[PDB]
Structures are given as C-alpha cells and as structure tokens.
From a paper:
To explore potential effects on MHCI stability by D76N variant β2m, as compared with the WT species, the prototypic heavy chain of MHCI, HLA-A0201 (HLA-A2), was refolded in the presence of each of the two β2m variants and of two different peptides. MHCI76 pI and WT MHCI pI produced isomorphous crystals belonging to the orthorhombic space group P212121. In both crystal structures, the electron density is of excellent quality for all the 14 MHCI units, except for the 87–91-residue stretch in all 14 HLA-A2 molecules. WT MHCI pI and the MHCI76 pI complexes are also well superposable, displaying a root mean square deviation value of about 0.5 Å over the all Cα chains in the asymmetric unit. The thermal unfolding curves for WT MHCI and MHCI76, presenting the same peptide, are almost perfectly superimposable; conversely, both WT MHCI and MHCI76 sigmoid curves are markedly shifted according to the nature of the peptide bound to the heavy chain. When the same experiment was carried out on the two β2m species associated in their MHCI assembly, at a trypsin/MHCI ratio of 1/200, both β2m species turned out to be fully protected from proteolytic digestion.
WT β2m is a well folded 99-residue protein, adopting a β-sandwich immunoglobulin fold, which is very stable under physiological conditions. The MHCI is assembled in the endoplasmic reticulum and thereafter transported to the extracellular side of the cell membrane, to which MHCI is anchored by a short transmembrane domain. Human D76N β2-microglobulin (β2m) variant is the prototype of unstable and amyloidogenic protein that forms abundant extracellular fibrillar deposits. Here we focus on the role of the class I major histocompatibility complex (MHCI) in the intracellular stabilization of D76N β2m.
Residue numbers in the entry:
A (entry chain m): 1 to 9
B (entry chain B): 0 to 99
C (entry chain A): 1 to 276
Write the structure that this text describes.
C-alpha cells in the first residue's frame, strides 16, 4: 500500500 | 556514476529433458546503469517473443532482471543468452549448459 | 517467521529520447505482488500475484494514483538533483528509491526503512530510529535540512509503523495460501570427472521458497567455504528459487564430502552424502 505521497528531494 | 558489469546465469526453469516443454532463463544481475540489451538465442538467432521481469535492485543498488521464454530443448538445438551493456566492450555470449 | 513488505522505484532520465522511465515493484517477502511501468500500456498499478487480485476498484484506483504521484515527484527530483550537482542538463541519470516495513513472528512492527540513491550511490536514507537521516553528501544535506524543517521523517515514521504494517498483515492473511507457505528445496547431487586426479561435485537446490537458503560443503564433517563455488540464488521464474554449490575433489575421495542444506521449509538440516 503506497505512501499517499513523497516529498521532493 | 558507478558502473557495474552484469553477471549472467543461463538456465531452464525445470530440469532439462529433450522434447518436453520448459522455459529458458537468462538472469542478469549486479549491473548499473539499468539500460541493458538481453536476447535469448536459438542456434544463433534472436528468439522473438521473449518476456522478462520488472526492473528491481539489491542492497548495493545494483540492478537485476529475469528474461525468459517458453521452449522445447532438443539435442540438436544450441541455446544461449546475448547481453550487451555499456560496461561490456562487446556483447557477451553465454551458452546454456543443461546437464551441469 | 518475520515478514517484510517492500516497494522499489527506479526512474531514469532520457534526454532526447523522451520523458523519464519510471518502474515500481511491490514485494511481500520474496513474492512480487504489484507493478507499474511508465512505458507500459495499461498505465495502472497491475496485480502480479493471485492474492492481490482480490482487491476491489477502490484499491487499484488508489494505488494507481499514488504510484503516479510517486512518478511525478521523481520527474521533479531528476531536475532538482541535476541542479544540486551542477550537471550538464543533457545526460541520462538514475534515481532509485526503496522503502518498506518488517514485522516479527507476532506480525507486529519490527523495522522500518527508506532509502534513496542517485546514479548508483547512496544519496539519503532514513536511519534505524526512524527519526533522523543519514545524508551521503552536500546535496543530500540540502535535502536533509529541507526535510528536517518540514518534519518529513515524522510523516514517514507514521506510515512505516502504521499503514505499512497494517496492510502488510492484510496481504499475509489474504495471501495466506502462498505468502505464508514454505516450499522445501528439492535436492540432488551430480558428479563430474574433470581429470584422472580430479572430479567436480555439485549440490543442487531447486523449487524452494523463500530465496533464503544455505548450501555449504564439508570434508570429513569440517567446513570448506574456502574451496567451493556458490552461485547467486536465482529465480526459476514461477515464484520459486534455485541454487547450487560446487566443490572440486581428488579422485577416490567423493565419500568424504557432504552438502549441508538449510532452509526454513525443512524440519532439520539436510545432509546429502556420497553413498554408493
Ligand atoms: Cl523452441
Ligand atoms: Cl524495455
């Protein structure tokens, strides 16, 4: 179940 | 930009038996970058409808892929795996050894 | 045993060729269960394990959207990373990312991780405590400082302890038939005369799951990791794994050597002796 989001590097 | 040369193992899914349907495997691993040409050869000729795994990597970030095709080994047909990669000066050809 | 869930992400920039290549693969233990490839035609997260096909439309729409937000962030990062390192905006680069959770025998959160690499080298990684980061260089530090200010590890930690662990367990119950199985290795040995004074013994392990296995050789009962050849464990392609260990021996001493197979699916370690 993926992350609802990932924060840009 | 690390660059790792791909290891290559060529094998069948099940133990080889002549005239029984099986799957030919090329397993290329330990490489980087991910761009890599892999063809399975029957008597030198590229097999056309060859499927392969999704790209994935290991603890050290190096890439791996499983190429595979359905096939019937007979005692006359010689099979091999041809890999080309930016680390390789020239295509590497690994022959299939069944009865190892 | 303890179980794990893991997602792998690779995005490769392709200047001149077109928009970056994005690939995602989802694992529970050693079984793949989903995937997404930007170059594929579905544009969906796709099931690659029977047990995940159970899941309803609410699920696939959810996963599909999230993997695309994942892809889009990487679209941006390729740009930002290139900028950080002042790199000729014309060259193919690679970002890889892997994250996930482990649980114990009790199926309770055990471990959490999140790892990020740029061009094959470590970039940034959540540390074992799930509160702070290890940054590999000055670029990574910039990301660290940014991520620290905005309390990112906190959000991640929430997920790795919570959702990750909860859905892992969901996948294990639902996929109980297969994920929780062990396929004991099918073993046999082969003999190969190489000279008049030298023969190659090979120990074979096929059809076993999970990939974790140990094959070692022993002369008269004493280990010989010094003189053998292990091959990297490899996929059969049908969900199972294979491996062989080889040792070259003097003619007439084959009976002294034994292969010792150890695998979660076996009751007690297998000894295979050269009994005539
Ligand atoms: Cl054929
Ligand atoms: Cl491709």
């Amino acid at each position: 179940y993926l992350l609802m989001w990932i924060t840009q590097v | 930009m690390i660059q790792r040369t791909p290891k290559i193992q060529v094998y069948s899914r099940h133990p080889a038996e002549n005239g029984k349907s099986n799957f030919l495997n090329c397993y290329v691993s330990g490489f980087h970058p991910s761009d890599i040409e892999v063809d399975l050869l029957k008597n030198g000729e590229r097999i056309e409808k060859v499927e392969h795994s999704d790209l994935s990597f290991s603890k050290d970030w190096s890439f791996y892929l499983l190429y595979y095709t359905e096939f019937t080994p007979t005692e006359k047909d010689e099979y091999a795996c041809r890999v080309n990669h930016v680390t390789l000066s020239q295509p590497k050809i690994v022959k299939w050894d069944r009865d190892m | 045993g303890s179980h794990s869930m893991r997602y792998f992400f690779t995005s490769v920039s392709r200047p001149g060729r077109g928009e970056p290549r994005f690939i995602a693969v989802g694992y529970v233990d050693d079984t793949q269960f989903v995937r997404f490839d930007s170059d594929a035609a579905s544009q969906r997260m796709e099931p690659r394990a029977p047990w995940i096909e159970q899941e309803g439309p609410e699920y696939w729409d959810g996963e599909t959207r999230k993997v695309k937000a994942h892809s889009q962030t990487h679209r941006v990062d390729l740009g930002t990373l290139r900028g950080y390192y002042n790199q000729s905006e014309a060259g193919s680069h690679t970002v890889q990312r892997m994250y996930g959770c482990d649980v114990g025998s009790d199926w309770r959160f055990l471990r959490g991780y999140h790892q990020y690499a740029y061009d094959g080298k470590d970039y940034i990684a959540l540390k074992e405590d799930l509160r702070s980061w290890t940054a590999a260089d000055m670029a990574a530090q910039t990301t660290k400082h940014k991520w620290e200010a905005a309390h990112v590890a906190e959000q991640l930690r929430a997920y790795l302890e919570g959702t990750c662990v909860e859905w892992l367990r969901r996948y294990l119950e639902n996929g109980k038939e297969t994920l929780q199985r062990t396929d004991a290795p099918k073993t046999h040995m082969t003999h190969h005369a190489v000279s008049d004074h030298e023969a190659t013994l090979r120990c074979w392990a096929l059809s076993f799951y999970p990939a974790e296995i140990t094959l070692t050789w022993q002369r008269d009962g004493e280990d010989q990791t010094q003189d053998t050849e292990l091959v990297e464990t490899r996929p059969a392609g049908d969900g199972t794994f294979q491996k062989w260990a080889a040792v070259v021996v003097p003619s007439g001493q084959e009976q002294r050597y034994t292969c010792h197979v150890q695998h979660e699916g076996l009751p007690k370690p297998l000894t295979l002796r050269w009994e005539p």
